[PDB]
Automatic annotation (TrEMBL), chain A:
It is an enzyme of class 2 (transferase). Its EC number is 2.3.1.-. GO terms for biological process: response to antibiotic. InterPro entries: Amioglycoside_AcTrfase (IPR003679), Antibiotic_NAT-like (IPR028345). It comes from the Bacteria. Cytosine binds at W77, S78, R79, P80. GO terms for molecular function: aminoglycoside 3-N-acetyltransferase activity. It catalyses: a 2-deoxystreptamine antibiotic + acetyl-CoA = an N(3)-acetyl-2-deoxystreptamine antibiotic + CoA + H(+). Acetyl-CoA binds at H32, S33, S34, L35, S36, I41, Q67, A106, K109, S175, T177. This is Aminoglycoside N(3)-acetyltransferase. Pfam families: Antibiotic_NAT. Belongs to the antibiotic N-acetyltransferase family. The lineage of its organism: Bacteria, Bacillati, Bacillota, Bacilli, Bacillales. The gene is aacC7. Keywords: Acyltransferase, Antibiotic resistance, Transferase.
Amino acid sequence: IVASTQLPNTIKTITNDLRKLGLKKGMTVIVHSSLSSIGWISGGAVAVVEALMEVITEEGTIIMPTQSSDLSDPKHWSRPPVPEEWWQIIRDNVPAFEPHITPTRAMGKVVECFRTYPNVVRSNHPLGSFAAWGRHAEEITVNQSLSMSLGEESPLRKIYDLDGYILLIGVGYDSNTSVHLSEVRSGACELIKVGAPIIENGERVWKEFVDMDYDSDKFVEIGVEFEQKGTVTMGKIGNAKCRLMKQRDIVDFGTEWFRKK
Amino acid sequence: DIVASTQLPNTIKTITNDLRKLGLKKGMTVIVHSSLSSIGWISGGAVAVVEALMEVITEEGTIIMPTQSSDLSDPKHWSRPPVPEEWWQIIRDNVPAFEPHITPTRAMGKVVECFRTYPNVVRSNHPLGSFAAWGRHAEEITVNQSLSMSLGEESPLRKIYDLDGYILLIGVGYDSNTSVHLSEVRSGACELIKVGAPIIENGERVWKEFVDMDYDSDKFVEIGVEFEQKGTVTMGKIGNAKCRLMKQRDIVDFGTEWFRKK
């Protein structure tokens, strides 16, 4: 990242970049990131978390998805998949989700760092959890539904209700979790029978439930079109191409988009 | 891939069994070094490994892992790669302070990253050379780690030595065997250098200068090969991983004499 960078990215410079882009105090923002994309950072992930906190403050709210899809029913694993003989073994053995414990997958280093921070709170979903910090942290994360995990009873809906923002740091619309709310609303996806391990009555139980067969693959196309409207702000955090936008704007657009096929 | 090279999944159960086979047991004091991937496909990944270790050792024993955060070091000593000199002071002025709850590890692995965030896990207070521990002696092991001579007589390594603890290598070699650094200290194997790191001092960030040995784990592989001729290391597998269980005092003492003899 070194060659790609003039002078170090720091907490300070990131805070600059953030405010430049339009972030400020008191804002409600869900954040999606690629650490590497920014360039060389003095402090790495910590520096990004710290800068985000410094801009937003305790008076605002930072959210990130903390997915742990590796806890899911492997019959549904299509990349990569695993031998079918492995399936029951998995169901019988994979350890239970616990918010204060279970690592994320495919979320990134900023997320992993964020998750561990003091006063960060994580929702209680074994597969599709979110973490949050600040004013509306609890409100956003509490009482996530097991079934329809990214639906109307989810952190996505809470953010919507709050007229929050989405920030993409060096990632694409396919990383844009909120658009899953669009899939839900539009009924864009088949319902599937799923499973995951949870703690019930202080013991591990493999829980069967129902959710949408979420597919972000389609989100890239959606975002392009969405961006024709011209309501997405853009700038750089270090080397990172960033986008800032209203969650409601994109979610509404998405829902509509899906309805039209 | 990891998938391809695995027959059936590794689980908490299978790992536990493998551990017990190797000789890990309830109430033992053990420092663990690991490569997650070496094991093969694991249902639960890093969590499974941690849970297995805890299941075997229990709270009546102690698990320790190094939680090094070398990224906090003075970029003056940096070679992998080096950074422009102009950067150095910018770094010293801006790199965030070590905080045991927050600061990620580097080059320790996913098992460590998981372990260090578990409830009841405690981490020592060194901005570069910290250790995390769980169970009976976790506190004793982790407290009052010296800033200078970080891996010496006033460190977790010494504490493990005193407890006559064990070392488990999971799919890693002696270059990862942190305890041999205590051999370096004891034999005067390395030059003393001026180092620095960012710490919270009086609730305020501070670039703190201190002295430590120019530790070099590159010599440890040679040491380990000679050591093993003694036949005091138990070898076995966890899944696909080649593993080693040994007494910490055995290798530390051997290493000390090794360095002295040159």
